[PDB]
Design an enzyme around this catalytic site. Structure first.
Site, PDB file in Angstrom:
ATOM      1  N   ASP A   1     -16.441 -22.854  10.202  1.00 23.11           N
ATOM      2  CA  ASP A   1     -17.524 -21.987   9.718  1.00 23.11           C
ATOM      3  C   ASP A   1     -17.405 -21.654   8.203  1.00 23.11           C
ATOM      4  OD1 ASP A   1     -18.405 -21.820  12.554  1.00 23.11           O
ATOM      5  OD2 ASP A   1     -16.736 -20.482  12.804  1.00 23.11           O
TER       6      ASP A   1
ATOM      7  N   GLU B   1     -27.273 -20.543  15.960  1.00 22.54           N
ATOM      8  CA  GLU B   1     -26.371 -19.645  15.245  1.00 22.54           C
ATOM      9  C   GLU B   1     -26.046 -20.092  13.807  1.00 22.54           C
ATOM     10  OE1 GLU B   1     -22.882 -19.517  17.687  1.00 22.54           O
ATOM     11  OE2 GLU B   1     -22.249 -21.549  17.132  1.00 22.54           O
TER      12      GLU B   1
END
Ligand SMILES: [Ca+2]
Length: 449
Positions: A11, A202
């Site tokens: 991420d 997401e």
């Protein structure tokens, strides 16, 4: 000539500090680079003795207690605000749960140590103990977001925003006070941009482009795991808070529901692929599985754009790395991703002799699938024809390419860029193209030389 050393950062969130690029990621994985190709890992986990947030369990007791977790934080993004300090927006949670919080930690120095600043958004309230959600009504994980995955950015006017969310109620945006980093009062969870009712999306990130004067919303669809079909989606808005629209003109506020349904929306930038005709697992060949959860950067010194993401690999399960690629804007103001990682390449006009030839061609489609796409062979011919596995026509104007390709009983127009890139696996410079249709499908071509 270019060489690489990746980092292990899940991420990844990009920030530039002086002449050094940092990425901050899940588990406090942090790495840095001067050239975007060689990365020094500076932290790998959120253990009690890490230097980024020392004694994290006590320091971030508020968010971690809320999330019922320890020794972990997810998807941190560091941004420098007007006081010059570095503010780490992050989230605390547990796998599969909407019991989550967004927090802020602060440091005077990029590498830390960061201390607790604020707790800003919470999800997963159990009414009998915790009371209402942030909007004053009981928490309902279909409608309300999961307080995960902060994406913070200044708009062109100097206002500060946070887009956020993962599955559950969807992807929301809050306006923040530029002077404090806190959400301006009275917004609840803010405005819903995409999703709802447990839609598989997401990692939202918004990037402003000066070159087009649009904001671009990046999302990851699907699951992050090897079999999850993680893929990067793009939409754009003249406003930081939307509505965002895809290349077909669909509004992302209407993007919600099943995987099949949400797949209809957005520009899909990349999905799983491997540059092998042989097999779907070939460790010599360049390829990605579940590339996603990205950030992006515009470099004003060079006018280049970059995407920072993690990915898994064909045949290697859950192992992942940071990757960095260049993004380009096509003639319609949409981003197209460079097939290979960034090796210093600068677009320029190529002569015809460098364009004409046989290509490996990958069509990334529109679906959320764990299928590892492989290339077919096509030729771009001197007379403007496309032959081989597909038929059509191509043309170019400077570095802008247009491909008109026959797909069943229709022609699909793909618009993109042509350049020379470093072939990551073959170790030589090659012509590549990368292009996007109005139905949001990406194609890549890599010239066989
Ligand atoms: Ca993020």
């Amino acid at each position: 000539q270019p060489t690489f050393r990746w980092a292990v950062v899940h991420d990844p969130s990009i920030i530039k500090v002086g002449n050094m690029y940092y990425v901050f990621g899940t588990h406090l994985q942090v790495a840095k680079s001067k050239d975007l190709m060689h990365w020094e890992q500076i932290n790998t986990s959120a253990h009690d003795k890490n230097p980024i947030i020392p004694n994290i369990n006590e320091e971030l007791k508020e968010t971690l207690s809320w999330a019922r977790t320890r020794n972990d934080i997810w998807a941190p993004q560091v941004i420098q605000l007007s006081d010059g300090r570095y503010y780490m927006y992050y989230c605390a949670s547990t796998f599969g749960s909407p019991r989550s919080a967004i927090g802020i930690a602060v440091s005077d120095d990029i590498e830390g140590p960061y201390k607790h600043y604020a707790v800003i958004v919470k999800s997963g309230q159990v009414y009998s103990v915790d009371g209402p959600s942030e909007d004053g009504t009981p928490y309902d994980s279909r409608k309300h977001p999961n307080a995960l995955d902060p994406g913070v950015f200044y708009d062109k006017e100097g206002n500060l925003w946070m887009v956020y969310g993962s599955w559950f109620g969807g992807i929301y945006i809050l306006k923040l006070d530029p002077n404090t980093g806190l959400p301006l009062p009275g917004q609840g969870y803010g405005k819903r941009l995409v999703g709802g009712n447990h839609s598989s999306m997401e990692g939202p990130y918004i990037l402003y482009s000066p070159d087009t004067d649009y904001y671009y919303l990046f999302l990851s669809f699907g699951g992050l795991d090897y079999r999850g079909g993680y893929n990067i989606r793009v939409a754009r808005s003249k406003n930081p808070n939307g509505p965002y629209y895809d290349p077909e003109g669909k509004s992302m506020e209407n993007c919600m529901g099943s995987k099949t349904v949400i797949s209809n929306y957005g520009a899909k930038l990349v999905g799983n692929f491997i540059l092998s005709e042989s097999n779907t697992i070939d460790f010599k060949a360049f390829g990605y599985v579940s590339p996603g959860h990205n950030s992006a950067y515009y470099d004003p010194e060079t006018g280049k754009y970059f995407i920072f993401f993690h990915t898994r690999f064909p045949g290697r399960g859950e192992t992942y790395q940071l990757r960095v690629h260049q993004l380009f804007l096509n003639e319609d103001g949409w981003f197209v991703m460079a097939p290979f990682p960034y090796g210093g390449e600068t677009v320029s006009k190529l002569p015809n002799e460098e364009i004409v030839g046989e290509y490996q061609f990958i069509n990334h489609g529109k679906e959320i699938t764990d299928k590892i796409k492989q290339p077919v062979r096509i030729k771009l011919n001197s007379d403007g024809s496309i032959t081989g596995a597909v038929e059509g026509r191509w043309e170019r104007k400077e570095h802008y390419i247009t491909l008109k390709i026959i797909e069943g009983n229709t022609t699909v127009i793909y618009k993109g860029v042509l350049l020379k890139q470093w072939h990551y696996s073959e170790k030589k410079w090659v012509t590549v193209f990368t292009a996007l249709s109005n139905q949001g499908v990406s194609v890549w071509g890599i010239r066989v030389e």
